[PDB]
């Protein structure tokens, strides 16, 4: 499990900025912090982990101070730029911790400027990273004088992160360990070749295996697409295969997934199940 907090700040000009955050525990979202909201929102019933209400309110007040100070601090620091105040400015932060067994973990805090990684927090201090703009040297020196900020960040990375997260993992156990079954279906489009598509939708957790098969042979030309999210936090994936016309005959799409309890989905091209599916999904192509 990788716990990640992601902040995205946009600074258009001297008078306009916006900061938005999201928090992820593996691939489930646990928090949202919109720029228009004074407070961090829970996106799960268990998003408070094992912290008390007054403890949660203390962590939050801390971040509420951070969000205002970050904004003012950047607006000053952009005066120090190579051509001064080179708006628009995009800053991204990615902080968090990888959780391992049994209670072992590694923390990170990465910062990007214009889509480019430039700064990390490391041990006790901020560091520019190879290839960072030279004008960042003075800002980082200045920031590194703030030992109060540095003690807070160290405490967040070393202790608050892994501890908060071990409670989230306990409180969120049934959601994190949920199994949702993929449903599969077939279709085809032109490439004198055709392109066959196996659509696999609604699986959780994320790892699946989807291959085009001819009997027991794995068709090595199978191109597995990207994992695409659905709105209910299940996943969607298609696998495709380029075949000459009159060869769909005999191919199947096999799907293996933890939720299927040992019984794979196998869809044969041309099968009664496929024909009855295709009848339900006919359309005019314009």
């Amino acid at each position, epitope marked *: 499990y990788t716990f990640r907090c992601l902040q995205m700040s946009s600074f258009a000009n001297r008078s306009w900025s916006r900061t938005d955050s999201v928090v992820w525990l593996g691939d489930l979202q646990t928090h949202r912090w919109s720029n228009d909201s004074a407070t961090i929102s829970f996106t799960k019933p268990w998003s408070q982990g094992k912290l008390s209400n007054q403890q949660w309110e203390k962590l939050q007040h801390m971040f509420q101070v951070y969000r205002v*100070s970050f904004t*003012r*601090d950047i607006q*000053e620091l952009v005066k120090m730029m190579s051509p001064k105040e080179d708006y628009p400015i995009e800053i991204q932060l990615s902080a968090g911790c990888e959780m391992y067994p049994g209670n072992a973990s590694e923390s990170f805090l990465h910062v990007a400027f214009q889509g480019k990684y430039v700064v990390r927090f490391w041990g006790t201090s901020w560091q520019t990273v190879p290839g960072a703009p030279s004008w960042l040297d003075l800002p980082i*020196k200045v920031l*590194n*004088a*703030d*030992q*109060g900020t540095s003690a807070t960040v160290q405490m967040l990375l070393n202790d608050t992160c892994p501890l908060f997260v071990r409670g989230l993992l306990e409180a969120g156990k049934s959601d994190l360990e949920k199994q949702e079954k993929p449903v599969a279906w077939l279709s085809s489009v032109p490439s004198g070749h055709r392109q066959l598509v196996c659509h696999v939708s609604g699986f959780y957790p994320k790892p699946v295996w989807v291959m085009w098969m001819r009997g027991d042979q794995e068709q090595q030309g199978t191109h597995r697409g990207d994992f695409l999210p659905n709105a209910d936090e299940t996943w969607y994936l298609q696998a495709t295969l380029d075949v000459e016309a009159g060869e769909e005959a005999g191919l199947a799409c096999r799907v293996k997934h933890s939720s299927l309890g040992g019984q794979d989905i196998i869809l044969y091209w041309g099968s009664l199940h496929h024909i009855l599916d295709a009848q339900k999904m006919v359309w005019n192509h314009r």
Partner: T-cell receptor
Amino acid sequence: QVEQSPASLVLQEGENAELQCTYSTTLNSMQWFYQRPGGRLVSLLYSPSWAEQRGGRLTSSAASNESRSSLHISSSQITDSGTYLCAIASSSFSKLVFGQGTSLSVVP
Amino acid sequence: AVTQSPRSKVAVTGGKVTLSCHQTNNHDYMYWYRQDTGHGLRLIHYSYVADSTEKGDIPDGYKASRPSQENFSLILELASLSQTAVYFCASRLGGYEQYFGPGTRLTVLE
């Protein structure tokens, strides 16, 4: 945005002085200055919010729940008479924002 | 640690006045403040590094120049009566505590 109080204080040599500085931001650092009229601005104390105070006749402390720090003068002498100015930085990037000062008169 | 010159100045309305501040602390920032009795300092201009200048809170009537790491000047191109004040230079590393110069009393007169 930085407030000092009282605006003036009179006291007898030997008495302790306490001077307040209230502010409405985060506290990176507090700097106190001493000045006689038409004189230079002399640094008395620099205290970052994370540093330990160094004991002596002149010290500072932050109020517990409150955005407020004090200057403490032990056993005031006639030569402590002058103006005391508070300045607050809110972060390592901000400006040093100055109060309007306390007039201290130590009388024999 | 921080010096200023001249120590004192009397000028006429419309005159050009230059105040100089000097430091060899290896400091990054330099500042110009004015003080009016009485008594908080107000920031006029400041600077991060050689050859750049940033406007403070009350920059109207003043220009600043940072010809090198060591030197920071405040220029009043057309002195006016409202510029009668004491001026303090200051410097700092990063980062840290501000060190102040001894001040210059300026009197602008008809």
